[PDB]
Amino acid sequence: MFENITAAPADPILGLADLFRADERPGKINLGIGVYKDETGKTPVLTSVKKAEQYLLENETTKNYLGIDGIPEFGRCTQELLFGKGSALINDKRARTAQTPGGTGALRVAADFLAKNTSVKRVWVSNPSWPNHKSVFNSAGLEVREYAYYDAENHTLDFDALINSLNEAQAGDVVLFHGCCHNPTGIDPTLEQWQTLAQLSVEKGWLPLFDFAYQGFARGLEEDAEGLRAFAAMHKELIVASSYSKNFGLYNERVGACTLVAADSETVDRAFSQMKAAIRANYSNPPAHGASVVATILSNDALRAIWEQELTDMRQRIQRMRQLFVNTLQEKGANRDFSFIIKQNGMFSFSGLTKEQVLRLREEFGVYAVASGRVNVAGMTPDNMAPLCEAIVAVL
Amino acid sequence: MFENITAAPADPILGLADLFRADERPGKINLGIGVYKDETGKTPVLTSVKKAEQYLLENETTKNYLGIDGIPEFGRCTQELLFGKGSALINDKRARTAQTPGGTGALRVAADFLAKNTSVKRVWVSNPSWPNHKSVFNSAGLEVREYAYYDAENHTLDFDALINSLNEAQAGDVVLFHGCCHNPTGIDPTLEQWQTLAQLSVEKGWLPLFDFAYQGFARGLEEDAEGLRAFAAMHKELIVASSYSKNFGLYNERVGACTLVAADSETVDRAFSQMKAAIRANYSNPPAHGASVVATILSNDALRAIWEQELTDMRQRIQRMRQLFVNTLQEKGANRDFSFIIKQNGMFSFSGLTKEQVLRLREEFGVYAVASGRVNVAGMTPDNMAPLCEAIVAVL
Numbered sequence: 001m002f003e004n005i006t007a008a009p010a011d012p013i014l015g016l017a018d019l020f021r022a023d024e025r026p027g028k029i030n031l032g033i034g035v036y037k038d039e040t041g042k043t044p045v046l047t048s049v050k051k052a053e054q055y056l057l058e059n060e061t062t063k064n065y066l067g068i069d070g071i072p073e074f075g076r077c078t079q080e081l082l083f084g085k086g087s088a089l090i091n092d093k094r095a096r097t098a099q100t101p102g103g104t105g106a107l108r109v110a111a112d113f114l115a116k117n118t119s120v121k122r123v124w125v126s127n128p129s130w131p132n133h134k135s136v137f138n139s140a141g142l143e144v145r146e147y148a149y150y151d152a153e154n155h156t157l158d159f160d161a162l163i164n165s166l167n168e169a170q171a172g173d174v175v176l177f178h179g180c181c182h183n184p185t186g187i188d189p190t191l192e193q194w195q196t197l198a199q200l201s202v203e204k205g206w207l208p209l210f211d212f213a214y215q216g217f218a219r220g221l222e223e224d225a226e227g228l229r230a231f232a233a234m235h236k237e238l239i240v241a242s243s244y245s246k247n248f249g250l251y252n253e254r255v256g257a258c259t260l261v262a263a264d265s266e267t268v269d270r271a272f273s274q275m276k277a278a279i280r281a282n283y284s285n286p287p288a289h290g291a292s293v294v295a296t297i298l299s300n301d302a303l304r305a306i307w308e309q310e311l312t313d314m315r316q317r318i319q320r321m322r323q324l325f326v327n328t329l330q331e332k333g334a335n336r337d338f339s340f341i342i343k344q345n346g347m348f349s350f351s352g353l354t355k356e357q358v359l360r361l362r363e364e365f366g367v368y369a370v371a372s373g374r375v376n377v378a379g380m381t382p383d384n385m386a387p388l389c390e391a392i393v394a395v396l
Numbered sequence: 397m398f399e400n401i402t403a404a405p406a407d408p409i410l411g412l413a414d415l416f417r418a419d420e421r422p423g424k425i426n427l428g429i430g431v432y433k434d435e436t437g438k439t440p441v442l443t444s445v446k447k448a449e450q451y452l453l454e455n456e457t458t459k460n461y462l463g464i465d466g467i468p469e470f471g472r473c474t475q476e477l478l479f480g481k482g483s484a485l486i487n488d489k490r491a492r493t494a495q496t497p498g499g500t501g502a503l504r505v506a507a508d509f510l511a512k513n514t515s516v517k518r519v520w521v522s523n524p525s526w527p528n529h530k531s532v533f534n535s536a537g538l539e540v541r542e543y544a545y546y547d548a549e550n551h552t553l554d555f556d557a558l559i560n561s562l563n564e565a566q567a568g569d570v571v572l573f574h575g576c577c578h579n580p581t582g583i584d585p586t587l588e589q590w591q592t593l594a595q596l597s598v599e600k601g602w603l604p605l606f607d608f609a610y611q612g613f614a615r616g617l618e619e620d621a622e623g624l625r626a627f628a629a630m631h632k633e634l635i636v637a638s639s640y641s642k643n644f645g646l647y648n649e650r651v652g653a654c655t656l657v658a659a660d661s662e663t664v665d666r667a668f669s670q671m672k673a674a675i676r677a678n679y680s681n682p683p684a685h686g687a688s689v690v691a692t693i694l695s696n697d698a699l700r701a702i703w704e705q706e707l708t709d710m711r712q713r714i715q716r717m718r719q720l721f722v723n724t725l726q727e728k729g730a731n732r733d734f735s736f737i738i739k740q741n742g743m744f745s746f747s748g749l750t751k752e753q754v755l756r757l758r759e760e761f762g763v764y765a766v767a768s769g770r771v772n773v774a775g776m777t778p779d780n781m782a783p784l785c786e787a788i789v790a791v792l
């Protein structure tokens with residue numbers, strides 16, 4: 001049965017992890033995978049998480065099944081994060097949340113859902129985008145088409161091209177938008193632009209699907225949700241896949257959620273029972289741990305007050321490294337202007353390096369970055385900034 | 397988009413959970429979902445698990461991504477459980493394990509794998525079987541056919557009918573076998589029978605797929621694996637989906653694994669890279685917690701010595717309740733012989749109650765059981781045994 005199986009090519013992102021610990025060469029620098037690192041190049045588990053975990057160890061009395069959609073309070077706390085405590089969506093009971101194994105899992109369950117219970121055939125994804133978007137939607141039998149987004153020359157959001165590309169999407173097609181911290185460009189629409197697309201979207205009849213994996217990494221919790229909230233006030237239905245892997249440092253615990261929004265309580269409820277059926281046939285019910293942690297933190301002011309500060313620290317250190325990288329590059333004689341980098345939000349900078357340059361950086365200097373030239377700024381520290389910048393300069 | 401969505405019917409198993417806490421009527425008894433309960437009707441978290449969790453809280457320094465196939469030691473410890481420490485499969489490096497969100501998740505990833513990289517079109521499932529088997533395989537686009545298994549009259553394994561049904565399966569079809577504690581009949585093949593099927597399977601060219609969710613609940617760890625081990629010594633390729641939800645009391649942490657076996661190291665490795673691609677497009681990487689616990693327990697003799705005893709206690713209490721149920725039924729004037737129940741292994745007894753009887757038991761007495769007449773013996777206690785038995789007798 002397996003004699004004919006061809007080997008799949010290594011994952012463009014997760015594959016770097018293998019190569020990185022395959023070459024024992026002293027000063028390697030890992031700027032590939034999107035994981036936060038502190039000034040010492042460590043990925044620590046947050047203090048609030050350690051506190052919440054202790055509490056759980058004290059108070060849990062059972063590991064009995066969670067129920068298909070997970071922990072209620074979790075689902076409730078996430079909607080308030082996404083839509084706002086006031087929000088009519090919450091009051092009209094128009095939204096339903098399922099706890100899922102990470103944002104990726106939320107994208108898959110949404111894909112499986114749309115594929116079996118809807119007439120969706122094609123999903124529109126930005127160009128460029130996170131590489132795994134294609135694979136997830138293709139796994140569910142949906143088709144992926146690309147819409148223009150980034151202006152390489154100016155390092156700008158090519159809005160006119162975005163608008164003009166989307167014009168080929170028909171009523172009933174799904175359009176994927178990144179909530180904030182666009183992966184991998186780091187360029188997001190302004191609120192005015194989010195508004196224009198909110199409206200264009202209602203006239204052309206597209207079903208919006210937001211990928212929210214970095215809430216809190218651009219300007220703040222409530223600000224990063226503005227675009228989504230602009231859409232929810234104007235739309236009757238929409239899906240949102242959010243992740244807690246980055247903003248809670250819970251990467252390997254797989255914590256995320258798929259939020260379904262419909263016209264009214266009765267409708268979202270019917271639609272949701274099918275989403276639950278799709279979960280049952282996939283992984284049955286979600287892993288409790290990571291989600292329990294998030295819920296306990298969110299539910300306790302002391303704990304939540306400490307978390308918001310840890311999040312604020314993460315974001316600020318990244319903004320620091322961002323400006324340092326640019327300054328050291330100019331200091332090291334980079335034959336180019338990299339100022340645009342300071343303008344990007346989130347963990348990544350679309351550096352502009354060519355495939356060949358990133359290949360040489362790795363083989364020659366032990367510097368790891370994604371083929372597309374995406375570099376993890378959050379992996380930069382005052383200690384590796386100089387070796388890194390010299391590697392880059394000797395490659396331009 | 398959602399105006400037309402029809403509501404999915406409630407899950408035949410997980411749906412009972414809703415109904416049960418929907419009726420506030422004092423003496424309700426829950427014999428539906430397969431969860432272990434101790435003499436006081438509680439589902440406690442195991443002591444070894446509490447110990448392992450404390451250790452993890454002390455020693456974990458990061459929640460960084462786990463890598464598509466999960467924790468190595470976990471994968472390694474599971475293969476030794478399944479195949480045995482000696483085993484040529486392990487020494488020849490013919491097996492590859494992926495850590496997955498529960499046994500259900502392992503069944504899905506195996507389904508997705510077989511569907512995209514193989515010429516499998518149909519999966520053979522016993523009649524009766526765990527209800528979610530159909531849905532998982534149908535989610536992946538595979539077809540499910542049923543093979544005769546249980547003799548209702550005699551409460552025996554209708555081997556001749558089993559053999560005769562399987563004769564319609566062609567070379568290249570997947571046949572699902574339950575390792576031990578057949579859900580829901582509790583009747584398993586003898587080793588001699590496992591042997592006959594091991595051989596019949598090689599001549600007819602079927603790809604075996606074992607569902608192992610109750611290892612340790614029949615007679616013991618190594619004994620419950622005998623059938624599988626009889627097959628692995630005779631087969632060149634096979635897949636095994638195992639679960640740790642019951643034997644480790646880790647239900648909601650979602651801990652299981654999908655083990656792939658091929659002719660040689662080079663082949664299993666090529667095949668496996670595709671299995672990894674299927675995981676990446678589903679949930680990316682598995683939840684660490686539950687699996688870390690299992691690995692720490694398995695890796696430490698003190699901890700593992702305590703676990704094996706807790707498992708032994710669970711199994712023994714069930715065997716106790718099994719004989720008590722039968723004795724109280726006869727004591728309460730049951731107009732029938734229920735002796736066959738003592739002969740069944742695992743958590744469930746196929747009682748023989750009709751759909752109508754189980755419907756009446758619920759509405760009239762607050763006694764919850766699955767439509768098929770499957771009752772959770774592990775949910776019986778000396779305290780509810782009498783109310784329960786009277787409910788049943790007044791329904792025969």
Ligand SMILES: Cc1ncc(COP(=O)(O)O)c(CN)c1O
Binds near residue numbers: 101103183211
């Ligand atoms: C845009 C985007 N969407 C979803 C995810 C998947 O996140 P998770 O690791 O939570 O599964 C990521 C990973 N960073 C992402 O960048």
Ligand SMILES: Cc1ncc(COP(=O)(O)O)c(CN)c1O
Binds near residue numbers: 607652
């Ligand atoms: C036969 C069988 N297979 C798989 C599973 C799924 O187990 P999990 O809860 O580990 O996902 C179960 C549930 N008891 C089962 O009974």
